[PDB]
Design a protein around this nucleic acid. Structure first.
Length: 238
DNA sequence: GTCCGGGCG
DNA sequence: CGCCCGGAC
């Protein structure tokens, strides 16, 4: 592994921006929301991976399309350490509904965002005692517990991309024009309980096939506009 | 299974 | 917010 210095990342970010609109290699394309991150990684010599640690060693690289109304930032994924498994949660709380990409394909899905401080429409809520104990409830019924390690996200290099082309098309292109370094992470307990940091469940299954469901891992997520509640130091790198 | 990379109206 | 995907090993 290469552990990057800040100077080397800043130099690399400038190089990337200066290239302008980058394409999706034919070998990489797979109708994938995450291609923005795949491209940003490849520009940094980071190959596709499922390693837990920050992919630049001292930093973790995150790429996002510069949408006017942005999706939340996915920080990392983590299964519960205790209680109901995610598939058990899917079995119970999942629902049968056509694929949103191909309406001729029926899925069972659980795509839900769970927050502390309130119940969502499925009745699900979080209560954090500490970062090491975040509890999932259905109403007053305990379900599962997460113990989250945030070492991968201690230092983020967040990079925003302007786009041309239709979203998730082969012809989509990305110009990385802005980047921030976020460091000095706060404790997440309050952030869970105040509804700032959220957990997404993202599980689905093609019910015409005899595959099991695809659990993409419970996502810890944060809106970009609340990153200042998670990190006390934000630096404009690009 | 358990992580990685990210979306929409 | 309710709701949503593509991968790796």
């Amino acid at each position: 592994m290469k552990i990057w210095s800040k100077e080397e990342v800043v130099n690399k970010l400038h190089e990337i921006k200066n290239k302008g609109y980058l394409s999706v290699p034919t070998d990489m394309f797979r109708t994938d929301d995450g291609v923005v991150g795949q491209i940003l990684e490849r520009q940094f010599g980071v190959q596709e991976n499922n390693i837990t640690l920050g992919d630049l060693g001292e930093f973790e690289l995150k790429g996002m399309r510069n949408r006017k109304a942005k999706s939340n930032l996915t920080l990392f994924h983590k299964k519960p350490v205790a209680g109901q498994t995610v598939i058990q949660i899917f079995n119970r709380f999942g629902y049968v509904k056509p694929s949103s990409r191909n309406p001729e394909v029926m899925k069972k899905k659980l795509f839900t965002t769970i927050k502390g401080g309130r119940l969502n429409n499925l009745g699900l809520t979080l209560n954090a005692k500490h970062a090491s104990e975040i509890n999932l409830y259905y109403q007053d019924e305990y379900l599962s517990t997460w113990d989250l390690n945030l070492s991968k996200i201690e230092k983020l290099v967040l990079v925003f991309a302007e786009t041309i082309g239709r979203a998730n098309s082969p012809e989509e292109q990305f110009h990385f024009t802005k980047a921030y370094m976020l460091t000095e992470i706060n404790d997440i307990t309050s952030l869970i309980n105040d509804g700032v940091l959220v957990m997404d469940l993202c599980i689905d299954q093609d019910l015409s096939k005899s595959k099991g469901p695809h659990d993409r891992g419970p996502h810890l997520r944060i809106p970009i506009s609340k990153l200042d509640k998670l990190y006390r130091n934000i630096e404009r790198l690009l």
